[PDB]
Amino acid sequence: MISSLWIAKTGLDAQQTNMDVIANNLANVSTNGFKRQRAVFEDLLYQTIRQPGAQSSEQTTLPSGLQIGTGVRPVATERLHSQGNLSQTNNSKDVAIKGQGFFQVMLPDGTSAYTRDGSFQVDQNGQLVTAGGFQVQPAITIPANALSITIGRDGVVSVTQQGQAAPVQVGQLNLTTFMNDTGLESIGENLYIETQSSGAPNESTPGLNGAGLLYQGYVETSNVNVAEELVNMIQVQRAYEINSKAVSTTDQMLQKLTQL
Amino acid sequence: MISSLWIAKTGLDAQQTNMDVIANNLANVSTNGFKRQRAVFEDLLYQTIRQPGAQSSEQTTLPSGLQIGTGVRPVATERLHSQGNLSQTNNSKDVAIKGQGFFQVMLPDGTSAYTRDGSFQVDQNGQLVTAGGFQVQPAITIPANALSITIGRDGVVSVTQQGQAAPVQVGQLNLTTFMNDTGLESIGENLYIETQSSGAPNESTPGLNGAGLLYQGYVETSNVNVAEELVNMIQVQRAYEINSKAVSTTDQMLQKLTQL
Amino acid sequence: VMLPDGTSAYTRDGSFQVDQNGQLVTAGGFQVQPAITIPANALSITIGRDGVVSVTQQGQAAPVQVGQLNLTTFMNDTGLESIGENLYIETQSSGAPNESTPGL
Amino acid sequence: GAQSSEQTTLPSGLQIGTGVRPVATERLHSQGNLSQTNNSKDVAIKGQGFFQ
Amino acid sequence: MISSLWIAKTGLDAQQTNMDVIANNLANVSTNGFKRQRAVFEDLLYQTIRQPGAQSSEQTTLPSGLQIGTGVRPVATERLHSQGNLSQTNNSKDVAIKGQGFFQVMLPDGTSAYTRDGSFQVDQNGQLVTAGGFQVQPAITIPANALSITIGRDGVVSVTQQGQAAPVQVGQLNLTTFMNDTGLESIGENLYIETQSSGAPNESTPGLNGAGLLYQGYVETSNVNVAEELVNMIQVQRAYEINSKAVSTTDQMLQKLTQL
């Protein structure tokens, strides 16, 4: 219709994507291990009408020619992989992560995903599974009689038996690091999958090779800064307000064009 | 309507559920043997617009693609099976448990239930019931002429007849251990039942196979930390604040859209 | 930044990332110039006020230097032709790009 | 650290910190007082020592 | 959106970080050896409109030009390394430090950590560690038949052997001092690691080379002045109220700009 209306459409859609990301951040407070998202925007085509070069006289230069430009296409959503805060669950089975790293998990299809969520359990077979029955990697089968479970800062998980007063180690629980964490493709369930932007997953014991440490009895909280979200949401409402006013102005102009 | 309003609605549901859990934990203080509940959350679908991989040109790769995401689906609620504080009740029919294990009970339907409440009773037949006529198992019959009942830390229950200078042994009170204490389903009445998440029940004498000990004259208090519950209450109230603010913001965005 | 074609554009947008190879790319995969490759297990990245980008390692108690974040100044900034993706391109009216370190 | 220039060093970098995790509730074994019960079967230890 | 809203956003973030610092100090009372934290703020760019010099006429000069300015960027958080109160813990295994100095520790990764905590403990191999098996430096082994362990104010550790009436010299406990105590990067666990701003560590016996003395049987308390933290918390609550008022005013300005 009119060049202005498509541009204002792009503005409305971009501000709506901002509100979408803000609402998804806002709702996932109290989601352990959740990572904030933030949209990155990007201007679209610029229709060149006079070239910024394009000599004007036999000597002059025509600086800064005409180009109009459209669109605010949202180009990406970065995910902030900073350390979230801890909290006392006082659950022997919940473990948070001190720094980089991920827990590897085996999906029913046999593929592997990665989660920063320490809300672990034990199923009827003694395997550590994570709130949805996903059997973690590497396998850890707790013996049926076990009284106490401990997980060191280096990850060696060891149980205490009845009578046998020696904390026999039962397994090793190691982390996986990516050289670009931001590029992982989240699939819900607090689970990310490997994509060819993240890089090959390198498995290591905690503490070594740059991976984080392990804190048993804690869970890492979502790193959502709520004040930033409220002020951002005020900003988004006012930006949508402005772009709607642009649409209305274009509409009224096109009115008195038709009435003509 | 808007992709933001559904997300905020899921956020309202999540905070409402978490407040439900907090309220149930809070109200069940002074309920013996009650185990604190804790809700574990998890985000739903991420609707992707640009894949995090998906090389654009022959050299570019487009790191950190654009996907929006929705929802805070409450994935589970764990139950903290830690030893509750004992208090000296001075009653001979209150037996508490020190360590893992559950008393078995016969429901009137014939199937078996399990409970950590020792505030026992003796019914008009003299059998050992629990506040609801639920016959503990295996059935223990207290003779009419008994003056006292003593329940040792080994679970060996005996009574003192009048005249006879001997505590005739009237039975053995054995516990039951499950591999996944958290996986037991709660049916109310402070009673749990068998489910395949829990695993097969292992019946055993108190003391052996990792089962607990019995403390007569003690009651096991609910492990509901009032401080953690109140701070959770504050946080949940504020999260509900913020999510309703998000709903309001999207509503105003929509209404100015409509006015045009 | 270096476009897929091979030529260079100029952006004022700092929303940087890193790709699967460690290169510093700009929200769409265009490699910044000069190339700066963050090492695999860098606990933290720091970018000083003059652009010296460095990282910390797993106990090496000093930030290993990783690269320089140069900028360019133009005689006429308003003359740059914008092409989208928040990228400008050098024209006849902008003059040559005077590469320099920040602060000088 | 975080060398902020060719030469500037930026001492005392900013970092926030969280939490007061209690590692333990340890058992203080110090010498206490003694009281007179006048019972031959009641014995008190003065100084280091534990009853087997 | 509006410059006012960006400036106020930075103000809210700054007050939030200040309150975070205050809350961390407040929570960490009664934590041995903890050092108070103080946030230093620093305004962001000043966007000039009329240059403060910039001769207007050929004789006048335009003093004090117009520049607007933004932001309150928190530049640093220094850690006050002042001596805390010593309290008589009466334990033969708690040693405080009177004056500058840190106990060096070998991490499982092997890199050198440092702690100002004297709650030393002994593992199953008899050596000296600090609450987690962190093998102190230099290597010290308490003999199995040792009865009382004294840590002299000079820094020599000696044990009272079985039978022999001699407190045999069994090891040396020597401190480390830095040029920049404030620069040490805390990594939790009451541990500081050397950083390129702390300066090279200088190892020396306690009492010499400027290092402090060792007080056996004492513990050093966190130097947290509770009343000072209270006044800081009142002040930051006021400042946050004010900045939220600024955001509200900017938002109302915008709202009736659009309603126009």
Coordinates of C-alpha atoms in Angstrom, one line a residue, chain E residues 52-258:
Chain E
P52 CA 32.9 23.7 27.2
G53 CA 35.5 25.8 25.4
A54 CA 34.5 26.5 21.8
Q55 CA 35.0 30.2 21.3
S56 CA 31.7 31.6 20.1
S57 CA 32.8 35.1 19.0
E58 CA 36.4 36.2 18.3
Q59 CA 36.7 37.4 22.0
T60 CA 34.1 35.6 24.1
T61 CA 34.5 31.9 25.0
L62 CA 31.2 30.3 26.3
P63 CA 32.3 29.1 29.7
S64 CA 30.7 26.0 31.1
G65 CA 29.2 24.5 27.9
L66 CA 26.2 22.2 27.9
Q67 CA 26.8 18.5 28.3
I68 CA 24.1 16.1 29.5
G69 CA 25.7 12.9 30.7
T70 CA 24.3 9.5 31.5
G71 CA 24.6 6.6 33.8
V72 CA 26.0 5.6 37.2
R73 CA 28.2 2.6 36.2
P74 CA 29.5 0.8 39.4
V75 CA 33.2 0.7 38.7
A76 CA 34.5 -1.5 41.6
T77 CA 33.7 -3.4 44.8
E78 CA 36.7 -3.1 47.1
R79 CA 37.1 -5.6 50.0
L80 CA 38.1 -3.9 53.3
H81 CA 41.1 -5.9 54.5
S82 CA 41.1 -4.7 58.1
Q83 CA 41.7 -6.9 61.2
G84 CA 38.6 -8.5 62.7
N85 CA 37.8 -9.2 66.3
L86 CA 39.3 -12.3 67.8
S87 CA 37.1 -14.5 69.9
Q88 CA 38.3 -17.2 72.3
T89 CA 36.9 -20.3 70.6
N90 CA 39.0 -22.3 73.2
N91 CA 39.8 -25.0 70.5
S92 CA 43.3 -26.4 70.2
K93 CA 42.6 -26.6 66.5
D94 CA 41.5 -23.0 65.7
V95 CA 44.2 -20.5 65.0
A96 CA 43.5 -16.8 64.0
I97 CA 46.0 -14.3 62.6
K98 CA 46.8 -11.0 64.2
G99 CA 47.9 -8.8 61.3
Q100 CA 48.5 -9.2 57.6
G101 CA 48.8 -12.7 56.1
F102 CA 47.1 -15.7 54.6
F103 CA 47.4 -19.4 55.0
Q104 CA 48.4 -20.8 51.6
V105 CA 46.5 -23.9 50.4
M106 CA 47.0 -26.4 47.6
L107 CA 43.8 -26.9 45.6
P108 CA 42.9 -30.2 43.9
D109 CA 43.8 -28.5 40.6
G110 CA 47.2 -27.7 42.3
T111 CA 47.0 -23.9 41.9
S112 CA 47.7 -21.9 45.0
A113 CA 44.8 -20.6 47.0
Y114 CA 44.9 -18.6 50.2
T115 CA 42.5 -18.4 53.2
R116 CA 42.3 -16.3 56.3
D117 CA 40.5 -19.1 58.2
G118 CA 42.0 -21.0 61.1
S119 CA 39.4 -23.8 61.5
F120 CA 42.0 -26.4 60.7
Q121 CA 41.0 -30.1 60.6
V122 CA 42.8 -33.4 60.2
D123 CA 41.8 -36.0 57.6
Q124 CA 42.1 -39.8 57.8
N125 CA 45.8 -39.6 56.9
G126 CA 46.4 -37.3 59.9
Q127 CA 47.6 -34.2 58.0
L128 CA 46.5 -30.6 58.4
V129 CA 43.7 -29.5 56.1
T130 CA 40.9 -26.8 56.2
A131 CA 37.3 -28.1 56.2
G132 CA 37.3 -30.0 53.0
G133 CA 40.6 -31.7 52.7
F134 CA 42.4 -28.6 51.4
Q135 CA 46.0 -29.7 52.1
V136 CA 47.6 -26.7 53.8
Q137 CA 51.1 -25.5 52.9
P138 CA 53.8 -26.4 53.6
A139 CA 53.1 -30.1 54.0
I140 CA 52.3 -30.9 57.7
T141 CA 51.5 -34.4 59.2
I142 CA 50.3 -34.7 62.7
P143 CA 51.6 -38.0 64.2
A144 CA 48.9 -40.6 65.1
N145 CA 49.9 -40.6 68.8
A146 CA 49.8 -36.8 69.2
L147 CA 47.7 -35.6 72.0
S148 CA 47.8 -31.7 72.0
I149 CA 48.6 -29.7 69.0
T150 CA 50.1 -26.2 69.6
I151 CA 50.6 -23.6 67.0
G152 CA 53.2 -21.2 68.3
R153 CA 52.9 -17.4 67.7
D154 CA 56.2 -17.8 65.8
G155 CA 54.4 -20.3 63.5
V156 CA 56.0 -23.7 64.4
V157 CA 53.6 -26.6 64.9
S158 CA 54.6 -29.3 67.4
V159 CA 52.9 -32.4 68.8
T160 CA 52.9 -34.1 72.2
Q161 CA 54.0 -37.7 71.4
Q162 CA 53.1 -41.0 73.1
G163 CA 55.1 -41.4 76.3
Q164 CA 58.0 -39.2 75.4
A165 CA 57.9 -36.0 77.4
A166 CA 58.7 -33.6 74.5
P167 CA 56.6 -31.5 72.1
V168 CA 58.5 -32.6 69.1
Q169 CA 58.8 -30.0 66.3
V170 CA 56.7 -31.5 63.5
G171 CA 56.2 -28.7 61.0
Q172 CA 56.3 -25.0 60.0
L173 CA 53.2 -22.9 59.4
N174 CA 54.2 -19.8 57.5
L175 CA 52.1 -17.1 55.9
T176 CA 52.0 -15.2 52.6
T177 CA 51.6 -11.5 52.1
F178 CA 50.7 -9.5 49.0
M179 CA 51.3 -6.0 47.9
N180 CA 47.5 -5.6 47.1
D181 CA 45.4 -7.5 49.6
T182 CA 42.3 -5.8 48.0
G183 CA 43.1 -7.4 44.6
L184 CA 42.7 -11.0 45.6
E185 CA 39.9 -12.6 43.6
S186 CA 37.5 -14.5 45.9
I187 CA 36.4 -17.8 44.6
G188 CA 34.1 -18.8 47.5
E189 CA 35.0 -21.3 50.3
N190 CA 36.6 -18.4 52.1
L191 CA 39.4 -18.7 49.6
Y192 CA 41.3 -16.0 47.7
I193 CA 43.5 -16.8 44.6
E194 CA 46.3 -14.7 43.3
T195 CA 45.5 -12.4 40.4
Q196 CA 47.6 -10.2 38.2
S197 CA 46.6 -7.2 40.4
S198 CA 47.3 -8.7 43.8
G199 CA 51.0 -8.9 43.2
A200 CA 53.4 -11.8 43.6
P201 CA 52.9 -13.7 46.9
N202 CA 55.7 -13.4 49.4
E203 CA 56.1 -16.4 51.7
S204 CA 57.5 -15.8 55.2
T205 CA 57.2 -17.0 58.8
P206 CA 54.5 -15.4 60.9
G207 CA 55.6 -12.3 62.8
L208 CA 58.3 -11.4 60.2
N209 CA 58.5 -9.7 56.9
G210 CA 55.4 -7.7 57.9
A211 CA 53.2 -10.7 58.3
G212 CA 51.1 -11.1 61.4
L213 CA 51.2 -13.5 64.3
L214 CA 49.4 -16.7 64.9
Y215 CA 46.9 -16.9 67.8
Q216 CA 46.2 -20.4 68.8
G217 CA 42.7 -21.1 70.2
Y218 CA 41.1 -18.0 68.7
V219 CA 38.9 -17.4 65.6
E220 CA 38.8 -14.1 63.7
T221 CA 35.3 -12.7 63.2
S222 CA 33.9 -11.0 60.1
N223 CA 34.6 -7.3 60.4
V224 CA 31.0 -6.4 59.6
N225 CA 29.7 -3.4 61.4
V226 CA 26.0 -4.2 61.7
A227 CA 24.8 -0.6 62.3
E228 CA 26.8 0.7 59.3
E229 CA 25.2 -1.9 57.1
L230 CA 21.7 -0.9 58.5
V231 CA 22.3 2.7 57.7
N232 CA 23.6 1.8 54.2
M233 CA 20.4 -0.3 53.7
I234 CA 18.2 2.6 54.6
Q235 CA 20.0 4.9 52.3
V236 CA 19.8 2.5 49.3
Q237 CA 16.1 2.0 49.9
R238 CA 15.6 5.7 49.7
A239 CA 17.8 6.0 46.6
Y240 CA 15.9 3.2 44.9
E241 CA 12.6 4.8 45.7
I242 CA 13.8 8.1 44.2
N243 CA 15.0 6.4 41.0
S244 CA 11.8 4.6 40.5
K245 CA 10.0 8.0 40.8
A246 CA 12.3 9.2 38.0
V247 CA 11.3 6.3 35.8
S248 CA 7.6 6.9 36.6
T249 CA 7.9 10.6 35.6
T250 CA 9.6 9.7 32.4
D251 CA 6.9 7.2 31.6
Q252 CA 4.1 9.6 32.2
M253 CA 5.9 12.2 30.0
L254 CA 6.0 9.6 27.3
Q255 CA 2.4 8.5 27.8
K256 CA 0.9 11.9 27.3
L257 CA 3.3 12.6 24.5
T258 CA 1.7 9.6 22.6

